[PDB]
Design a protein around this ligand. Sequence first.
Ligand SMILES: O=C(NCc1ccc(S(=O)(=O)c2cc(F)cc(F)c2)cc1)c1ccc2nccn2c1
Ligand SMILES: O=C(NCc1ccc(S(=O)(=O)c2cc(F)cc(F)c2)cc1)c1ccc2nccn2c1
Lengths: 472, 470
Amino acid sequence: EFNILLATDSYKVTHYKQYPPNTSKVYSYFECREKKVKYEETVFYGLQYILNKYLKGKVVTKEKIQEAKDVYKEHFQDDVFNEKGWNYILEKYDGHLPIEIKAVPEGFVIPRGNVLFTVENTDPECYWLTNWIETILVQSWYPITVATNSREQKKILAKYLLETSGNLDGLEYKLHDFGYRGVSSQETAGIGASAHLVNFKGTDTVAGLALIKKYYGTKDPVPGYSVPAAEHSTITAWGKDHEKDAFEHIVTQFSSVPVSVVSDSYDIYNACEKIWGEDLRHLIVSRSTQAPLIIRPDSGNPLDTVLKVLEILGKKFPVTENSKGYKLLPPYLRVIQGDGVDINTLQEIVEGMKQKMWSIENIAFGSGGGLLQKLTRDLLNCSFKCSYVVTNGLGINVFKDPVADPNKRSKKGRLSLHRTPAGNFVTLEEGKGDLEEYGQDLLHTVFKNGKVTKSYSFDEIRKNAQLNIELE
Amino acid sequence: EFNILLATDSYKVTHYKQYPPNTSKVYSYFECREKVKYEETVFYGLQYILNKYLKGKVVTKEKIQEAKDVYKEHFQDDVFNEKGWNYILEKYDGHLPIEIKAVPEGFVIPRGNVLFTVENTDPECYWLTNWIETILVQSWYPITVATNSREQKKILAKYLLETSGNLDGLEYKLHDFGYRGVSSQETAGIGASAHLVNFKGTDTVAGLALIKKYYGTKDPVPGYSVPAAEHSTITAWGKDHEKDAFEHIVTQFSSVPVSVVSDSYDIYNACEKIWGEDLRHLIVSRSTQAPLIIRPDSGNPLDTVLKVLEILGKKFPVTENSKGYKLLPPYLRVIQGDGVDINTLQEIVEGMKQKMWSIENIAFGSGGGLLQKLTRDLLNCSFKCSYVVTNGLGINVFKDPVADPNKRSKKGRLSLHRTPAGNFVTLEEGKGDLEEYGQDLLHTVFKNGKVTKSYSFDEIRKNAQLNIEL
Ligand SMILES: O=C(NCc1ccc(S(=O)(=O)c2cc(F)cc(F)c2)cc1)c1ccc2nccn2c1
Ligand SMILES: O=C(NCc1ccc(S(=O)(=O)c2cc(F)cc(F)c2)cc1)c1ccc2nccn2c1
């Protein structure tokens, strides 16, 4: 069973002895720090998961305190653990954390360098608790970063889809989550998949569904969808000489729904031109527009291979030219590129298709490692810092400002988030929000004294995270 | 609660319909596929997966109904194999009729070798082998963390040996700072445990309980830490009271090692004037068992380490060790824990060597670099079907994409062997049966719901030792 007393960086166990004596308040904040492919704005998402799963309710017990005491005695080879401090929370608050957390609403899209949430203790005895939970709260970097990077890919797709087709039909199914096997754990799979679903509806990372249902909720039964598809094993199992038999069996099993079939087991170009394009053509041109074959290459240079596949298919199937002048495969036939796709290669592929006069209508993308794993906390510089303390009854504004790196300077004092007169965002420092020159603070209390005080549905989060082009 | 029926890639729900009719066996294998760096991998982490997710009664009536309900909405259709899962529930009390063979945990194996194999043990469950691909492939992560951590240990060992003449302290030279920088609590435990295969220093506390529950050590814990400041415990004192913070903290921890981040405002001033002059008397009085460990945390990592060492060397009595390298007094050390990954680690130790500074002087902390900045395509960790039985006939199967020979997979039943020179070789097409290469080195680790072979964390550590340590 999870123990919050064992869910911090080891050194934080020793910090209660290091703050200035007579310190009654430690106030800290999280931002995606500005840094001197740009990621200028971030989707705030995922805190509600952490608040519910790990922070709310009775999170301290006698047994958990003893467990931590025993572990830390060996881990430090010394008795440094603050048993008294944790006992206090147990006895006074029935094990509920005397912490208040204020946050921007989930789904909100905020420029870099703004306060996204703040954390402070609500009992002077618990001044040490604010930064105890830094480690667990900072893990919000991951769903923020997945959601943000997913949204940036949606912007690219929207731009090219609009240009090549005149509309955004199908946009929310253009980037499918293939990341389940490629992330570092089951828990990460659920969190990351849920973050991608903020922007798209296509996922094979099933773990995302239960997380959303439990922690956020949707009006619809599920937040994300998939359709049948082969993998290499269901093709190769038939034997090298029987690829065509495998293809025929699979498209016939799934004759009335969309089906995707990986086509590069031996020779993608032969598969497209001869097997799909000739031998089994009659099984393809008969399909419903609601049930296309989606051919999947899975190897070679992604751009070169997509273009060659499209060129091959365009000569074996009836291609039209849409109203924008771009080439369009018949509606029973589409392509998915799900190898080597990340934000950079996505851009390269759609730009290359545009240059060769192929509509983005023709293609969807799958992304696994690029979508959910190839991301770090330094992409958006997600960081938690103390900005305000009260010592001997006096508030002081505190910060770091390393001489050799101004990019690591942190904000000072009590913080608040506001709309500017032009409708942008600004973070006010030094308690200046109290002057009330900038309208209402956009941070809302989401956690206080062990209770989650404000929650958002997944539907609301999706609405908040919409693209401008979607609004327009 | 975890449900294995909901722990696969969506499309795999539809695969039972796609295999050749009358297929009784699907046999698959995992390797770190071959492509100059990362030539050998540490096999670690499967035992966690077997125990947490795969063993015992993992199928219930409730889990089947849950999956049925979810997949009906997810696919907007009834494609879920309720019958297949019910069969497992009824026939085997929900235990998976699967056999898994694997190389011992901690083993260091060159790329392109079979690491584990998976097959169904009941013909009715031919579809099950690849259902669990997704969960098993996540073994990539502890493998990759352990391997990358070990590669950093090789670098540290080389430079520590060169500059000091021994390997004293090696196992504390790379500290896990990765807890906040990984993607989840679960990942934190897994990754931290993988790093502990090679080192003993960690702040990622989650790793300790994972090791205790799933692996075990003779010692009470597998990893250790010591007190240290963070920026908040310095900056809280106010900009004009950095010295007061430093003095308070080293006095609170006067008889144990203590690390103090010194770059809140000006690292060079902190080293030369605060530690080097104002508080020098509190440093030179400390025990060899209780050094101050100064932590810079900003600027170019190599340049900052070198400048910090130069500053300290002029304020404190430096010696020259038997190898001709400079050594701070034993009560004073440095830790660099900003921007450290396998590449910058190499750059820093080589730069220190060029400036005649012993690696004895320094330890490294690594967070995102150690536990997060890794993907499955670093070692090309991959699961593929290589053998099937259909209509009672065994068939050797594989992929071999025309445009990428690197993605070619192995054929047939596989086994791992020692060569006459004592290296590893993977035999394909059942050729291990010819017994020309001795016994198969894989062991059955899982069979029909039970873990059949396992390893303590102590044995894993022994298996993963460096040659130079041996
Ligand atoms: O094919 C796979 N899954 C099935 C699949 C099929 C089509 C589409 S689509 O985007 O064309 C699509 C989405 C959708 F929801 C409605 C559609 F009509 C069309 C997406 C996903 C697959 C392949 C490799 C893989 N590696 C890891 C996980 N993986 C899953
Ligand atoms: O200082 C921190 N933790 C404490 C710490 C102190 C010293 C050493 S050491 O390697 O010098 C050392 C290890 C040890 F086990 C025995 C020693 F005597 C010497 C390692 C660790 C710290 C700093 C930043 C941070 N970010 C995330 C987590 N973080 C932890």
